[PDB]
């Protein structure tokens, strides 16, 4: 059961040392792994190949800030002096050959973000037009907030952040760090 375990999500302050972990299943503790990084609407891009002894070879257009290391079954990607452009989902992968068949497995990836603003709300009543149609949608727009976590309470559907977010009731209350 070849498995790679990753830390899923992590934010950092601009300038901080980041350090991501990719942990091999114990029967595979000696394996070389591959690091990739993936931008939002794009294929993953090769970053480095990391060996069990920490020796790594990086892909091209990959800053000196990026480095790798290892310890037991753990493979580490370290990003010193982190930058907004370093934001990516970082994914490790590993290949193996068993019974003359190649097999490859990806970790679940670790979403890395770089990081205070309190949200502003805009609320709209339903339109005349919509009312003629006997429906009514209340619109709560939430903008200008960092960091991303928000909860919204009022027939409700609320988007995720991308910060900005939206909620629709078919008073708008937004909680953010309090």
């Amino acid at each position: 059961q070849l498995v790679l375990t990753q830390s899923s999500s992590a934010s950092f302050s601009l300038g901080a040392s980041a350090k991501l972990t990719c942990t091999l299943s114990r029967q595979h503790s000696t394996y070389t792994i591959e690091w990739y990084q993936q931008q939002p609407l794009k294929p993953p891009k090769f970053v480095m190949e990391l060996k069990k002894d920490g020796s790594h070879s990086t892909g091209d257009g990959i800053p000196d800030r990026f480095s790798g290391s290892s310890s037991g079954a753990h493979r580490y990607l370290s990003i010193s002096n982190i930058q907004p452009e370093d934001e990516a989902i970082y994914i490790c992968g590993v290949g193996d050959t068993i019974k003359e068949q190649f097999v490859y497995v990806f970790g679940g990836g670790t979403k890395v973000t770089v990081l205070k603003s309190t949200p502003t709300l805009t609320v709209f009543p339903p339109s005349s037009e919509e009312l003629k149609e006997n429906k009514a949608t209340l619109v709560c727009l939430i903008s200008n907030f960092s960091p991303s976590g928000v909860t919204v309470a009022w027939g409700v559907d609320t988007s995720n952040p991308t910060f900005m977010a939206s909620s629709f009731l078919h008073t708008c209350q937004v909680t953010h760090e309090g």
């Binding site: 090769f46 490859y104 609320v123 991308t162």
Partner: protein, 217 residues
């Protein structure tokens, strides 16, 4: 130079079949096997397996034995992924990729093809102008909106005054059994309602272009 170009996005219904393309350029196609990788929305990458580009022989990853098939036409340097008996869980972006191996890693990737599998029928939005509830009085700014309701599939595009208003525009991401989103624009209260402000909503999949002008309520 070396590239992998994949066919465009696809929308299918459950039980149907689909084929995705991967056209390779810049290298000897039959030398490098072609790999396939699935990524469901928000989820992690699943290696689907690979096909030998010289003998044609496919090698499927365990969770992709049955409904999946790798094929090729070498003289066109093109690899294909076919998925049969489509279901909602097949909703994903699919990548083809090349691997170098002497150092080992995926060195080149298709741009991905996005597959949506849904029972929902293509549907144009209802567009509703959102005027503020009150007059601005002495606020410097005012915020106007558009409600784009019950459309399928993604995406729509909203502009304001045919693109003329750009700053102060915020289009929020859509929610869900159809899609609904909203766009807002913030303008000086000396601008609206004295001047005309219109939102332009385009939903290509249904070939709809709607203009809705914001009037005080």
């Amino acid at each position: 130079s070396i590239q992998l170009v994949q066919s465009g996005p696809e929308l299918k219904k459950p039980g149907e079949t689909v084929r995705i393309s991967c056209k390779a350029s810049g290298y000897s196609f039959t030398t490098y096997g072609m790999n396939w990788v699935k990524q469901a929305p928000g989820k992690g990458l699943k290696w689907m397996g690979w096909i030998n580009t010289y003998s044609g022989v496919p090698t499927y990853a365990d969770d992709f034995k049955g409904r999946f098939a790798f094929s090729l036409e070498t003289s066109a340097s093109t690899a294909y992924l076919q998925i049969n008996i489509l279901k909602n869980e097949d909703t994903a972006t699919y990548f083809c990729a090349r691997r170098r191996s002497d150092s080992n890693y995926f060195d080149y990737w298709g741009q991905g093809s996005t597959l949506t599998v849904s029972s929902a029928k293509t549907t144009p939005p209802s567009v509703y102008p959102l005027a503020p509830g009150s007059a601005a009085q002495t606020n410097s700014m005012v915020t106007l909106g558009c409600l784009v309701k019950g459309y399928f599939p993604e995406p729509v595009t909203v502009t304001w005054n045919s693109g003329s208003l750009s700053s102060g525009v915020h289009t929020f991401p859509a929610v869900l059994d159809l899609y609904t989103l909203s766009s807002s624009v913030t303008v000086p209260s000396s601008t609206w309602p004295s001047q005309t402000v219109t939102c332009n909503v385009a939903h290509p999949a249904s070939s709809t272009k709607v203009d809705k002008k914001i009037v005080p309520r």
